[PDB]
Design a protein around this ligand. Structure first.
Ligand code: HEM
Length: 154
C-alpha cells in the first residue's frame, strides 16, 4: 500500500498537535491499551505489577515508555513510507527480544486512534482518521513482513 501526499498531510497535521505534549499522549495511549487489552501489560517486566489506572498514571516508568513509543512512531510517520531503516531495529527487538505478536500492534493502533479522536476532534474527522488508519496499517504490514524475514510470527 501507498498513501497519497494528501493522506500524509492529514496524518502529519494531527501528529504536530500530538507533539505539543508527547508524554501526556504517551500515557493516555498506553493506559488505553492496558485497560482495553490487559494481557499486553504482562509484556512489560518493569510495570506488570500495576493494578489500577491511578497506579498507571503515577508511574514514571510508564510515562517514559509512552515517550519512547511515540518518539519512535513519529520518526517513522515523518518518513512518509520510506521507513525501511527505522523498521529494522524495531522489528528485531519486538520480534526476538520482547516477542510482540502483530495482534498487539493492532491493539495499540486502536488505542492511538481512540486517544487522537478524544483529544483532537477538530483535526481528526473521518478523512483524517482514514489516513491515520492507513498509515498504521502500512506500518503493521511492513513490520509483519520483517517479522517473517527474522523468523518470527507474521
Ligand atoms: C507503535 C508500535 C510500537 C513502537 C513504535 C514501539 C517502540 C519501542 C521502542 C522504541 C522501544 C525501546 C527500544 C526497543 O526495545 O526496541 C520499545 C521497547 C519495548 N516495547 Fe515497544 N513499541 C511498539 C509496540 C509495542 C507493544 C504493542 C508492546 C507490548 C504489548 C511493546 C513492548 C515493548 C517492550 C516490552 C519493550 C521493552 C520495555 C523495557 O525496557 O523493558 N511494544 N518499544
Amino acid at each position: 500500500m501507498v498513501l497519497s501526499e494528501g493522506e500524509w498531510q492529514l496524518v502529519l497535521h494531527v501528529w504536530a498537535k500530538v507533539e505539543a505534549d508527547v508524554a501526556g499522549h504517551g500515557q493516555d495511549i498506553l493506559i488505553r491499551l492496558f485497560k482495553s487489552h490487559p494481557e499486553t501489560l504482562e509484556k512489560f517486566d518493569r510495570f506488570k505489577h500495576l493494578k489500577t489506572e491511578a497506579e498507571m498514571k503515577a508511574s514514571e516508568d510508564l510515562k517514559k515508555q509512552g515517550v519512547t513509543v511515540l518518539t519512535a512512531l513519529g520518526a517513522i510517520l515523518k518518513k512518509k513510507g520510506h521507513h525501511e531503516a527505522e523498521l529494522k531495529p524495531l522489528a528485531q527487538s519486538h520480534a526476538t527480544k520482547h516477542k510482540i505478536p502483530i495482534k498487539y500492534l493492532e491493539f495499540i493502533s486502536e488505542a492511538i486512534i481512540h486517544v487522537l479522536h478524544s483529544r483532537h476532534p477538530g483535526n481528526f474527522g473521518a478523512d483524517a482518521q482514514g489516513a491515520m488508519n492507513k498509515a498504521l496499517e502500512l506500518f503493521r504490514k511492513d513490520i509483519a513482513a520483517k517479522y517473517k524475514e527474522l523468523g518470527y510470527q507474521g
